[model samples]
Structures are given as C-alpha cells and as structure tokens.
Target chain A: NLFVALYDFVASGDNTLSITKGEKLRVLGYNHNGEWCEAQTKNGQGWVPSNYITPVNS
Target chain B: APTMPPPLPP
Candidate 1:
C-alpha cells in the first residue's frame, strides 16, 4: 500500500525508523493497544507512534 | 507496551 507521507519523521530511542517526505511506508502491523505500530521504510524497520501516521489514499 | 512478543530468535 502506498500510504503516502503527510509528515516527515526521524526516529530515536525505542522507536527507530526514519522517514522522509513522500517516503514509502509499509505498516507491518500494530501493537500496544494501537498506541504504537511497527512500520518498515526503505532504510529502517521499527516502531512508530500510530498518531503520527494516517492512512492516505493511493 | 511494545513487547516484541518476547522473541528469543530463530
């Protein structure tokens, strides 16, 4: 799915996935009562705050 | 909350 980026993000600490504007993100899945989700970018794969992401129309 | 499901590796 081409869930396009609405904002750019770089990860630090426990969540470590760097995303650039328009970077392709494949949401592997979610955990923590949907508080956080695991996502994979071209550069990294780790956790991301679910609030920071929104499903975009591709 | 993220537990990684307690993976011990393959």
Candidate 2:
C-alpha cells in the first residue's frame, strides 16, 4: 500500500485523518478499503481521515 | 467455502 492523503478537506473528519498539507504520516490497521487509514503521528497513532495525506517519494 | 477475495485488497 502506498502513502495516502487529505486529498481535499470537505469539513468532514470521517473515521479518517486530520492532517495538514505536506505533513508526513503513516497508516495502520488499514483494511485497504477506500477510506480512513489508522495513521501514526507525533500525537500518537489514531484514525486519520484518508483524505489528509499524499505520498512523497521515499 | 468457495473462492475468497482475500481479507484485504492489495
């Protein structure tokens, strides 16, 4: 699974991530469905709306 | 059981 992102915030934080543009993050317990991915952040791992992240070259 | 699509997609 590649990196994902906020895509475009629509005032909604559905079982997904709450990340700002250009923020690096990781997902977890992912079902690979098409929605939220449990992301690990400085605040600790939690569900972040899959819409708040974008993959950067590693 | 029949054919399974697997627990996760990729």
Candidate 3:
C-alpha cells in the first residue's frame, strides 16, 4: 500500500528512510511495536516512523 | 511480529 508523509523525518540510522513532508511512499509493512514501518520512496527504501506518515486517503 | 530496526530516540 501507499502512504504520504505528515512531517519531515530524518533517519537516525541506515536502516531508516529519511522523508520530507508531503512525499509519497510505498509501505511494505510495520515493525512489532508499530512505531516504525518499512517504506520506499523515490530516493531510497527503509524504515520510517509510523507516526510520520499516514494513509494517502487520510 | 515483523523484524524492524530499533526505535528512534525520543
């Protein structure tokens, strides 16, 4: 599924995906705690904070 | 549960 960023997020690690607000991304899945999700953007693919993005329709 | 990277700092 796809999602859009709600705010700018800078990845704290190589495993994270840095995203800018309003950017579109494809969500692969979520982690155990649901605080982070696996997503892909134009620049790269990695984990992003779940709270940082929302369903495109929302 | 899916294996994910460690959580970010607050």
What ordering of candidates by lDDT runs from best to worst? Answer: 3, 1, 2
Q: Write the per-residue lDDT of candidate 3 for residues A1-58, one digit (tens) a residue.
A: 7889888877775588789999999999877678778898999989888878888664
Worst 10 residues of 1 chain A by lDDT: A1-10
Any runs in candidate 1 off by more than 4 Å, and if so which?
Answer: B1-10
Q: Candidate 1 on A1-58: residue-level lDDT in tens?
A: 4454556656656655666667668888878577666888788788766666667674
Candidate order (DockQ): 3, 1, 2
In order of the candidates, what TM-score does chain B achieve?
A: 0.22, 0.21, 0.45
RMSD in angstroms between candidate 1 and the native structure over all alpha carbons: 8.4
User: What TM-score, computed on C-alpha atoms, does each candidate reach?
Assistant: 0.64, 0.47, 0.78
Candidate number with greatest lDDT: 3
- The per-prediction i-RMS, to one decimal, reads 11.1, 11.2, 4.6
DockQ for all candidate structures vs. native: 0.08, 0.04, 0.19
Residue-level lDDT of model 2, residues A1-58, one tens digit each, is: 3454434332233343344555566655554564545676554555655445666667
Candidate 2 second chain TM: 0.21
